[PDB]
Each structure stands twice: as C-alpha cells, then as structure tokens.
Structure 1
Amino acid sequence: VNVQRPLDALGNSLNSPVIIKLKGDREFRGVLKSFDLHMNLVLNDAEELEDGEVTRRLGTVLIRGDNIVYISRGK
C-alpha cells in the first residue's frame, strides 16, 4: 500500500490470523479484529504461546501496542 502508511498492512489482515511477538519473548496468536494508530489491538480466540506450544486460551484480548515487537501473518 502506501510506503508511508505501514499500519495499512494491519488492515490487510483484519479478520485474519496474526502472530503477535511481545517484548520479553512472549507470543500471541489470534484473529485481528481491530487496532489503532498506537498499534493497540484486539484479538479474538487468542492464545498465548511458548516455544511454539499453546499455554493459555484467553478468548478475546486487548493488547497494548507498546509491548509489541512485531506482527506477522500466521495460520
């Protein structure tokens, strides 16, 4: 999309499964349902991963953008 609008890539993932990598190495998987300029975001049917192992099924969750390291598409 716009080379000045990197958050659009997030819009290109609305209702899709994403992978949230947090500072401290924590990982989160779920369906992106929204986000804002601060990258705060809402995940649906989100699950907390550890070394690739689900360790917590939270359901819907709001993640503060400040903690995010990266967001990538996943299955």
Structure 2
Amino acid sequence: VQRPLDALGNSLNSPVIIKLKGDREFRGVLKSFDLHMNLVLNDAEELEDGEVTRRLGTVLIRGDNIVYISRGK
C-alpha cells in the first residue's frame, strides 16, 4: 500500500527480517502488528553475527526496539 504501516500489511503471512537495536536480528513469519510496530512472528529465530542462536517459536516483539523490517524467505 501507500504509507509505511499500510504497506507493511502487504507482508502479513510472509517471511520477514526484523533488525533490532543492539544489532540483534529476528526472522520469522509476520502475523500481526499495530501502529506502534509491536508485532508477532511465527516460526521465529533470533540471529546474531549471522547465526541462529535461539528458536523463539511464536514471539511478540516490542516496536520500540525495532530499527528496520525487510522481506526475508
């Protein structure tokens, strides 16, 4: 869609890359999000330095910690 949050909806049910502050990263399937960018991923993995360090299954990430969001696979 148009504005950033409206567009983010196009990613629902798709794999995404969530880059967090502190140079942490999560990958998983986007299932929900609000206008604060709080969001839920399914089948999520936390990566660090490039390696998967934890399997977080379903996870709710607080938007305040997010740096950027991009398409994964």
Q: TM-score range, shorter-chain basis?
A: over 0.9
Aligned-residue Cα RMSD (Å) equals 1.3
3-state SS of paired residue (2:8): helix
- 1: CA distance, partners of 2:2 / 2:64: 20
- 2: CA distance, partners of 1:18 / 1:55: 17
Per-residue CA deviation, residues 13-63 of structure 1 (Å, 9 max, x unaligned), is 000000000000000000000000000000001000012211100100000
User: CA offset at residue 4 of structure 1?
Assistant: 6.1
- 2: CA distance, partners of 1:54 / 1:10: 24
- 1: CA distance, partners of 2:54 / 2:26: 9
- 2: CA distance, partners of 1:4 / 1:34: 18
TM-score (norm 1): 0.92
3-state SS of paired residue (1:24): coil
TM-score (norm 2): 0.94
Runs of 4+ in 1 over 4 A off after TM superposition: none
Q: Return 5+ residue gaps in structure 1 as ranges.
A: none
- 2: CA distance, partners of 1:55 / 1:9: 30
